[PDB]
Amino acid sequence: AYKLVLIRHGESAWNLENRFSGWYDADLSPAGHEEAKRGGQALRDAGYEFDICFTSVQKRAIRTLWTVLDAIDQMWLPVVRTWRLNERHYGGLTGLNKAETAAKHGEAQVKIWRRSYDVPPPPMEPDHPFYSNISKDRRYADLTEDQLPSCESLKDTIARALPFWNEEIVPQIKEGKRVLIAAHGNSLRGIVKHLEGLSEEAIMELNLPTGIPIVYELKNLKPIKPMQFLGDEETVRKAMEAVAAQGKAKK
Amino acid sequence: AAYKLVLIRHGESAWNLENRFSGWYDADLSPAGHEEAKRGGQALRDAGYEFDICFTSVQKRAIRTLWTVLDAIDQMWLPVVRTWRLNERHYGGLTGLNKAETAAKHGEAQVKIWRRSYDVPPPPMEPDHPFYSNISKDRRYADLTEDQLPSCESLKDTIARALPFWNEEIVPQIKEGKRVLIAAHGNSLRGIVKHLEGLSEEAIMELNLPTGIPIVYELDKNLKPIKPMQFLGDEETVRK
Ligand SMILES: [Cl-]
């Protein structure tokens, strides 16, 4: 009945520094730009067509979208940007590197934060070095004091992404529009959890590959089969083995 | 507090380098035209400009110009609206011909007429034309009525289909206090300039807008300019 496509952006400049990004507006590295080019070419070779596109207000996802639309010769499509598809907000951890947080905040808190669906990191306070860069950026000036986060658990991120799905994306799908969504890991986890009916435990163990297009075949918007991946069979198998091993090593 | 409006015309295209008529054919920028857009964006960055909403056409040479500018000024998050009403003039049967082939096929007298005329269109693009399916069966125009898809346009025609978008969508945004950027093409921008200044037909046919340079207007509460258009950039570029 309907076809939906998602794509997760690749490596950023702050991933090379092993630093928590969150709402900080870091750009793609050369490797992450290459990953977007490869996913665009896979869509081009298979003949995919879209009618409308959604992304966040962060340049690493917007530049991924731009690269895909260049590759498939569809730069003329309408594009809609929203803060509700941003990455999870990492609070006071924003800007710290990852071997430092265990010394700053303790091994017990690091374990809890990695394990839990509903425990937030510490808040970003006004003396934090990236407070003015993010909380006072004019792109968020139209948010209420309640909507602007100082920190987020996974449950929080999913709870602020799903109203945009429900209210803006679903009516385009029912109208027959072929939709493309270019966003981030945790905001796309929200959509996947809602579509497939996954548990909290399973969705915390699901890490999506980067730069690989994710395809859903859906009248009642229920998946006919689970997510499928577009690309060369061998390159896909290796990326999923890599992501699984990275997940297992963190426990 | 005069309203501030900024326009930019795209630079050199791949088909300019072959001296071929483009029109509604969707040719990309050349490397030099991309470099032009980078210099225009750097001029806006150095002057500290900020925008709230952007408008452009459905053609990739204008869209890529806008993308380059937003990258240079760190405003990639702004909302963007595309419309066919801002497209370049449709050159009809001349699409794809270079100037030599045009003179050989249609003669010198008709060439003088078409170049010198405000309201005489070129020949229509018919179903045997090489580019007829490429343009007139492109799905991006599927929601136009059969009344609206051109087989050819005079300059008068182009201006007549561009101004309804200015009047019905851009003017209310300016009256709400939004800071507007428009990235488009020579002839569609000519329509906006002719309306803003009250220019005659002959005057607008003599006006040639520079490429890749920010063009700035200051407007009063009735949206009339208070002084002539000005330009942003180094001394040499601005003076030229
Ligand atoms: Cl865009």
Curated annotation (Swiss-Prot), chain B:
Superkingdom of this entry's organism? Eukaryota
Q: Which residues does the record list as Phosphotyrosine (modified residue)?
A: 25
How is expression of this protein distributed across tissues?
A: Expressed in the liver and brain. Not found in the muscle.
Give residues annotated as binding substrate. 9-16, 22-23, 61, 88-91, 99, 115-116, 186-187
Which residues are catalytic? 10, 88
Q: Which GO terms describe its cellular component?
A: cytoplasm; cytosol; extracellular exosome; extracellular region; ficolin-1-rich granule lumen; membrane; secretory granule lumen
The record's listing under PROSITE patterns reads: PG_MUTASE
Q: Which Pfam families match?
A: His_Phos_1
Q: Which reaction does it catalyse?
A: (2R)-2-phosphoglycerate = (2R)-3-phosphoglycerate; (2R)-3-phospho-glyceroyl phosphate = (2R)-2,3-bisphosphoglycerate + H(+)
For this chain, the Swiss-Prot or TrEMBL PTM comment says:
Acetylation increases catalytic activity. Under glucose restriction SIRT1 levels dramatically increase and it deacetylates the enzyme.
Q: Name one GO molecular function term.
A: protein kinase binding
Q: Which SUPFAM superfamilies match?
A: Phosphoglycerate mutase-like (SSF53254)
Q: What class of enzyme is it?
A: isomerase
> Does the record's keyword annotation contain Phosphoprotein?
yes
N6-acetyllysine: modified positions? 105
Instruction: State its Enzyme Commission number(s).
Output: 5.4.2.11, 5.4.2.4
What keywords sit in the KW lines? Acetylation, Glycolysis, Hydrolase, Isomerase, Phosphoprotein
Could you say which residues are annotated as the site Transition state stabilizer? 185
Spell out the NCBIfam families in the cross-references.
Answer: pgm_1, PRK14115.1
**Described purpose of this protein according to its UniProt entry:** Catalyzes the interconversion of 2-phosphoglycerate and 3-phosphoglyceratea crucial step in glycolysis, by using 2,3-bisphosphoglycerate. Also catalyzes the interconversion of (2R)-2,3-bisphosphoglycerate and (2R)-3-phospho-glyceroyl phosphate.
The record's comment on protein family reads:
Belongs to the phosphoglycerate mutase family. BPG-dependent PGAM subfamily.
> Assembly state and interactors?
Homodimer.
The protein here is known as Phosphoglycerate mutase 1
The protein's organism comes out as Homo sapiens
Tell me what gene encodes this: PGAM1
